[PDB]
Amino acid sequence: DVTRIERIGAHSHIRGLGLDDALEPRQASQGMVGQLAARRAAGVVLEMIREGKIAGRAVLIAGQPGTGKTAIAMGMAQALGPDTPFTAIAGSEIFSLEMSKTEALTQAFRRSIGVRIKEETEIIEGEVVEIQIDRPSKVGKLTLKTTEMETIYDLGTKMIESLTKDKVQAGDVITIDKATGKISKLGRSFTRARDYDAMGSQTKFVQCPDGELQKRKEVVHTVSLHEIDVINSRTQGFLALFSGDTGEIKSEVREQINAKVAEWREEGKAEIIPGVLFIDEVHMLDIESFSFLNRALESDMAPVLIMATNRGITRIRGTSYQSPHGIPIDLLDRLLIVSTTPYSEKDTKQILRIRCEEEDVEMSEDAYTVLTRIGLETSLRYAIQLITAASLVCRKRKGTEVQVDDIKRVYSLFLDESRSTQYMKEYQDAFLFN
Amino acid sequence: PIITYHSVTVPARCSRTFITFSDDATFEEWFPQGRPPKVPVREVCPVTHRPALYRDPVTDIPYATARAFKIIREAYKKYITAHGLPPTASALGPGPPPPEPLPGSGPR
Amino acid sequence: TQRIASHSHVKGLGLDESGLAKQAASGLVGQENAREACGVIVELIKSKKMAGRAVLLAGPPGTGKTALALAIAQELGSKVPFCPMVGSEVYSTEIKKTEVLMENFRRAIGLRIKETKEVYEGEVTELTPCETENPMGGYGKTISHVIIGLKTAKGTKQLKLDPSIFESLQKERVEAGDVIYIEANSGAVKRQGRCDTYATEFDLEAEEYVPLPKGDVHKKKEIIQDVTLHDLDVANARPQGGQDILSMMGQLMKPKKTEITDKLRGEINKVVNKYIDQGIAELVPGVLFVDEVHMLDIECFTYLHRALESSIAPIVIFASNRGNCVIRGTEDITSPHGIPLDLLDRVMIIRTMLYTPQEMKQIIKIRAQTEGINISEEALNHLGEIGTKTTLRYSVQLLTPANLLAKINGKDSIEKEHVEEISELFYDAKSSAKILADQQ
Numbered sequence: 001d002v003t004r005i006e007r008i009g010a011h012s013h014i015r016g017l018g019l020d021d022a023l024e025p026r027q028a029s030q031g032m033v034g035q036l037a038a039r040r041a042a043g044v045v046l047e048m049i050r051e052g053k054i055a056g057r058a059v060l061i062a063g064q065p066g067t068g069k070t071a072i073a074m075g076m077a078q079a080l081g082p083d084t085p086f087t088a089i090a091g092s093e094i095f096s097l098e099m100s101k102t103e104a105l106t107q108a109f110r111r112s113i114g115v116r117i118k119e120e121t122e123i124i125e126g127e128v129v130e131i132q133i134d135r136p137s138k139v140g141k142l143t144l145k146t147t148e149m150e151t152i153y154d155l156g157t158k159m160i161e162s163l164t165k166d167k168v169q170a171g172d173v174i175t176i177d178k179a180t181g182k183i184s185k186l187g188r189s190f191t192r193a194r195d196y197d198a199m200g201s202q203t204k205f206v207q208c209p210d211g212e213l214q215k216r217k218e219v220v221h222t223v224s225l226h227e228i229d230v231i232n233s234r235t236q237g238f239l240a241l242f243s244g245d246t247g248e249i250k251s252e253v254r255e256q257i258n259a260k261v262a263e264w265r266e267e268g269k270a271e272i273i274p275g276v277l278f279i280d281e282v283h284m285l286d287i288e289s290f291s292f293l294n295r296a297l298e299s300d301m302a303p304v305l306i307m308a309t310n311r312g313i314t315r316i317r318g319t320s321y322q323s324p325h326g327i328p329i330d331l332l333d334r335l336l337i338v339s340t341t342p343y344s345e346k347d348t349k350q351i352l353r354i355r356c357e358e359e360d361v362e363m364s365e366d367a368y369t370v371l372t373r374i375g376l377e378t379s380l381r382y383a384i385q386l387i388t389a390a391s392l393v394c395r396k397r398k399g400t401e402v403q404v405d406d407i408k409r410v411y412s413l414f415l416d417e418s419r420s421t422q423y424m425k426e427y428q429d430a431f432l433f434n
Numbered sequence: 435p436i437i438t439y440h441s442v443t444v445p446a447r448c449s450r451t452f453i454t455f456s457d458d459a460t461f462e463e464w465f466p467q468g469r470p471p472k473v474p475v476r477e478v479c480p481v482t483h484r485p486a487l488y489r490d491p492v493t494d495i496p497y498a499t500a501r502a503f504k505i506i507r508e509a510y511k512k513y514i515t516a517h518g519l520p521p522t523a524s525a526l527g528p529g530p531p532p533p534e535p536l537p538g539s540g541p542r
Numbered sequence: 543t544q545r546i547a548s549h550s551h552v553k554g555l556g557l558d559e560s561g562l563a564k565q566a567a568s569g570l571v572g573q574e575n576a577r578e579a580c581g582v583i584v585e586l587i588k589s590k591k592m593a594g595r596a597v598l599l600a601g602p603p604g605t606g607k608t609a610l611a612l613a614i615a616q617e618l619g620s621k622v623p624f625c626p627m628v629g630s631e632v633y634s635t636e637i638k639k640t641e642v643l644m645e646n647f648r649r650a651i652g653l654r655i656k657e658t659k660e661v662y663e664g665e666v667t668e669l670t671p672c673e674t675e676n677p678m679g680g681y682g683k684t685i686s687h688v689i690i691g692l693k694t695a696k697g698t699k700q701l702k703l704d705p706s707i708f709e710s711l712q713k714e715r716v717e718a719g720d721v722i723y724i725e726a727n728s729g730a731v732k733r734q735g736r737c738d739t740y741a742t743e744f745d746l747e748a749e750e751y752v753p754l755p756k757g758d759v760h761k762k763k764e765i766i767q768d769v770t771l772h773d774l775d776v777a778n779a780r781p782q783g784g785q786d787i788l789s790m791m792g793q794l795m796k797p798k799k800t801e802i803t804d805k806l807r808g809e810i811n812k813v814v815n816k817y818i819d820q821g822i823a824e825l826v827p828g829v830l831f832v833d834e835v836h837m838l839d840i841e842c843f844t845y846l847h848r849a850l851e852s853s854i855a856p857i858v859i860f861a862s863n864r865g866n867c868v869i870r871g872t873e874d875i876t877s878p879h880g881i882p883l884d885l886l887d888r889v890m891i892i893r894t895m896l897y898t899p900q901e902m903k904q905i906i907k908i909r910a911q912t913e914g915i916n917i918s919e920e921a922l923n924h925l926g927e928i929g930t931k932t933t934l935r936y937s938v939q940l941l942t943p944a945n946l947l948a949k950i951n952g953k954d955s956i957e958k959e960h961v962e963e964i965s966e967l968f969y970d971a972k973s974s975a976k977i978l979a980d981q982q
Binding site for chain 1: 560575578585586589591593594595600603635636637639640651687701703706727778779780781800801802803805814815818825840845848850863865866867879880887888893896
């Protein structure tokens with residue numbers, strides 16, 4: 001029960017790359033199995049990302065379909081963690097009507113660079129022991145305490161306004177920003193009076209603050225360069241962060257922002273956290289897009305670029321020419337290529353074992369053997385998809401384990417590409433527009 | 435000054451509000467209280483009864499229909515003299531079937 | 543009566559308790575293997591464990607593959623979302639193609655928000671302040687409570703409220719005889735009007751003499767509302783606050799669709815997960831049905847590669863009738879079903895078969911029953927022969943004109959002569975195409 005928004009997806013079982021401390025891959029770890037050389041290369045690329053010295057390095061993951069290119073990408077994403085950016089898109093997403101392809105790629109590049117802004121603040125945090133306001137110009141008095149000390153404050157007018165709008169009252173625990181007088185209420189330490197009718201929410205309690213009433217603390221805020229661009233693009237441009245009306249941000253704004261971020265870096269305010277941009281199925285990009293990427297990768301603010309494609313010698317979109325991977329050789333020279341090999345019998349079996357664990361499915365060894373042979377014969381993804389169907393078939397007969405007969409049942413019910421194509425060729429007159 | 439708030443928490447550990455209006459006269463203009471009439475008088479037409487409709491005319495008393503209005507305006511010409519016969523004793527057939535007998539239509 | 547559509551006779555998959563398919567049940571006949579597979583798919587959807595698993599319904603035209611998808615909707619009921627779309631709908635003038643798909647992916651995920659509140663309401667009668675003279679110091683007169691008496695229908699009760707309510711109380715401008723609304727957690731007063739007891743042949747007020755409420759003075763209200771994730775995205779993307787000038791400026795300039803960013807999707811997923819954890823919301827993942835999927839471009843399919851791999855995604859059902867056809871957006875690339883092989887590896891294919899003459903006759907009888915038509919046996923057999931010769935759908939279309947023709951002739955049922963006349967007044971595609979050689 002309690003189905004959260006994240007359910008079991010295609011790559012949910014992947015939680016890392018399964019590498020040793022020396023980047024040497026384990027045969028099965030963190031949901032990944034097989035692809036030793038590609039996983040090792042991805043670990044090296046992940047270390048390059050972590051150090052962050054070198055800008056604009058590009059990597060291509062290549063191989064046949066079903067060989068775990070996207071799996072290696074999500075493994076890098078999970079191993080990298082949430083603190084560092086990881087922007088993932090498909091190549092088809094840049095073809096917007098709101099903006100040009102170059103603008104879309106510029107936004108995607110700048111989404112993947114983080115700015116770790118840091119500043120000092122002073123707060124007053126304490127349990128409200130007493131408050132008084134002599135409204136007739138208004139005057140008042142406030143008292144706050146911690147476990148250590150107590151202090152009475154004679155209030156100014158605007159502080160009284162903020163207190164009244166927030167309806168602060170005694171027994172509350174609050175935090176007051178010394179710089180601007182903003183108040184934030186953390187909870188209550190004392191119950192409200194039970195004599196009062198109808199205002200009887202039970203709520204929950206919070207401990208008294210400790211130590212000094214007034215403290216100075218460091219605070220860190222993380223924003224992307226694209227957020228800074230959109231905020232500074234126009235008046236009330238922050239709405240475009242959610243609506244997406246960021247149409248063709250002017251370049252002068254970006255130059256000013258880069259200079260200000262650099263001088264913040266020298267002045268100790270900010271740290272640059274360069275992340276990763278991942279473009280799955282990059283063969284959808286046009287020749288213009290690759291030409292733009294050639295120069296976009298030469299900036300010092302460029303992130304690490306990762307791409308995934310399966311094509312052999314294949315046409316470049318927007319042209320009549322052909323090249324390896326559907327990518328021009330202007331860009332292929334600028335990048336390192338990672339090759340994924342097809343899986344063996346044991347690796348397929350281990351992938352199916354790991355997938356059954358993720359889906360909470362128990363199957364016999366004969367069932368595993370049969371499904372492994374099916375996956376070798378047709379495809380890995382088809383064999384993975386049959387697991388849930390076979391489990392449902394077992395469940396409706398009130399079984400406890402998925403048996404070979406359930407697998408053959410769903411194999412009969414649901415068809416793969418080869419059989420469907422064969423049967424389509426039998427009904428070739430009935431099907432349309434051959 | 436009316437002192438919009440005063441909270442002390444002192445007793446179980448608690449939290450209260452003690453509004454102190456001061457100035458005497460400030461109290462009642464913040465608490466006038468009320469004593470309205472809970473319901474009105476349910477009005478009935480003198481002519482053929484049923485609940486009243488529209489309002490009174492420019493003078494006199496409410497009515498239900500245009501026929502009742504016509505009889506009421508044919509009435510009150512018998513009374514502006516301030517003397518004469520009964521202006522309303524079964525005047526102009528003012529809905530006369532008595533399941534329970536009717537007085538004259540002179541409530542004004 | 544309600545209007546009769548093509549698939550109005552479909553009410554379900556007609557499966558046994560064991561999941562096996564009855565030969566004729568719930569308005570469907572035949573397609574037993576496909577219907578059993580659809581049974582497995584509805585179980586998959588009801589399990590709610592899976593995200594992004596996809597299904598392709600493949601077969602010749604007229605084999606009811608559209609009906610099976612609608613039968614899946616009937617089995618799931620109205621709780622589970624079911625979003626139908628055509629492949630040709632992605633080509634919008636306002637937003638890119640991949641945004642249209644993601645909008646429909648989010649429309650298929652539902653959310654039931656079950657927020658609760660407890661309140662007090664009725665006719666105010668007191669406006670009575672309490673008094674304790676002094677706040678333990680130099681003093682004028684101190685109240686320390688405010689007595690508020692409510693009566694609505696069931697009874698009367700007095701509430702000794704916090705003194706702080708008094709500011710809000712004359713801010714709402716309440717007096718005796720008014721009727722109000724106060725929420726328990728906040729204590730926020732709201733004036734609804736004044737009772738109908740001061741009404742009934744008074745009238746003439748825009749506030750409306752709102753009637754004296756029914757029920758108890760104290761109420762606990764449990765509101766359940768169904769909403770999709772796309773609705774949350776659209777609502778949170780806009781500045782709906784009327785107090786800003788740009789909001790009312792939005793009235794005059796056109797409110798076009800916009801390309802919603804992934805940041806908003808992530809934040810809405812975060813707050814939805816928080817609601818689910820705290821118990822205010824329940825997730826209802828649903829179905830997206832993309833009929834005529836062959837109309838999509840190669841860009842759309844290549845985006846669906848990523849979209850179906852998401853852990854957030856719904857169950858997707860595709861339908862196509864094409865053979866080995868050229869993929870749209872490519873120059874010369876042929877593939878089965880007009881779909882790339884790379885996406886075709888990501889789906890489970892449900893095949894649909896051509897119908898026998900007996901199945902055609904049975905479907906024709908079902909449609910005649912659905913349309914309120916009485917047909918004789920020989921007329922039904924001749925119509926089945928026509929459907930065998932030309933097409934099932936064409937023969938099904940002849941029922942209503944023939945019934946109208948019989949009604950014009952005073953008869954209450956279709957005989958063979960009426961279908962014979964209708965088959966010469968109207969032509970099928972094949973017969974007309976043969977005629978096109980004659981009339982060039």
